[PDB]
Amino acid sequence: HHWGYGKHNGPEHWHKDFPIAKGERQSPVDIDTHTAKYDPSLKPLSVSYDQATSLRILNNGHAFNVEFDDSQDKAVLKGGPLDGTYRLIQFHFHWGSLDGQGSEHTVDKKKYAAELHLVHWNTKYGDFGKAVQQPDGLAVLGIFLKVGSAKPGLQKVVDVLDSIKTKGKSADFTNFDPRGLLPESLDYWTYPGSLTTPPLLECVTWIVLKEPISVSSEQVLKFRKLNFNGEGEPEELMVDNWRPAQPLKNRQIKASFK
Template sequence: MDHAWKEQRKGPDRWHETYPMAKGNNQSPVAILTKDVYKDPALLPWFTGYDPGAAKTIMNTGKTCRVTFDDTFDRSVLRGGPLQGTYRLRQLLIHWGSTDDKGSEHVIDATRHAGEIHLVHWYPKYSNYADSLRKTDGVAIMAILLKVGKDPKPEMKRILEEMEAIKTKGKEVPFQNFDPSILFPQNRSYFTYQGSFTTPPCDECVTWIILKEPITVSVDQMEKLRSLSSNAAGDPYCALVDNWRPLQPLNNRMVRSPCQ
């Protein structure tokens, strides 16, 4: 069992014993109250240019389902919104619950959704991904909330049909020709704030862009995610669920959204 996972077994409230940053002042996720959000006229729309050919593999890490993208050059990028430059897409991660009433990390107006997709991008003005983690503007994460409903978005299907192939921890299969922008809701409005990764070491390098409108998934689709095991193939099945971090204090941070 690798060291970091052993630490995580202690649970999020003890991560800081190994990763002191987890007790920092700018941690994520946070609860967002619409009435307290600052409508900022300076905030622009965001744009993505994703190359479907950049998608490489999909993996069960034992903690999440992860899609990896080729980030060796500006192949799939995010720009605009609160960002100063162009950020490269590196990975897609999913958080979900054991039941439909929990699973998302960010909570908006006291609503916690069934899941949350994170598209992780980094700022290539820094020499590499590891270097970007040490800078407050090094990473931009686009968050898409998942809510359970009657008309599921067919777009999740592509990811979910791979669940059989990555049942157990450490399983990884090729995942080609995938454009994550199909996951975006119609409404492009967003909340943004400065925060951290929601997994150790919880580096405080993230500009969060949380899309206000959730996308709809079905009960069956959520069950597919919950069918993954957090254990390796030879070990007993252990449902990979509730891989979301509890809320962190907002402290003096401001959550902003564009005026339009």
């Protein structure tokens, strides 16, 4: 598989290797704020990241990923639409070549500069690989980034990117606190969807925060200096690593807020 984000191997092509690309619960989607309905049944969202244990940051040729120790319930997402306990395994971002694009979800067709995905797996399935085979296997917390003031809790990430410029590079990334990436409010939209990259599995409860975080132009500029390629390969800048909005089909997006 040689999927990517170019003309020749990008989202329009994915369906030939991964036919679920044209499925019934693909992600991302546009969130129409005048169609989403407040759901009083939603319980409060619980983000419990006090004991989060980060390990390493990796360039995988698609994004940069920060991985966590998920051998115990150290950092978990519960509540909201979720039943049971979802364990944080990793986070990554999607971003644009310019500030006017980069997010995967859109809000009334508005694209943000970037989008953060905090990836959690349902502990009743025992490991990530089993969880992605189930319709309720993952919970992904999605956070929009807009360009404005710098986000101090992102700067440690930005500071290491020079050490993982190319595909297959990794660095130690211990003692990072992902609480510094959250906005003040946990107001959210939720809907059932998919992984936004191959294999595009329909295993995700999406929880997309309404309040974006602000990052500085300097911070997102540094994301854009990464490379999709490996060392010694022709340089391709790691930009526009987002999939566009997919058909909502027979789904409803629920709001946690009036």
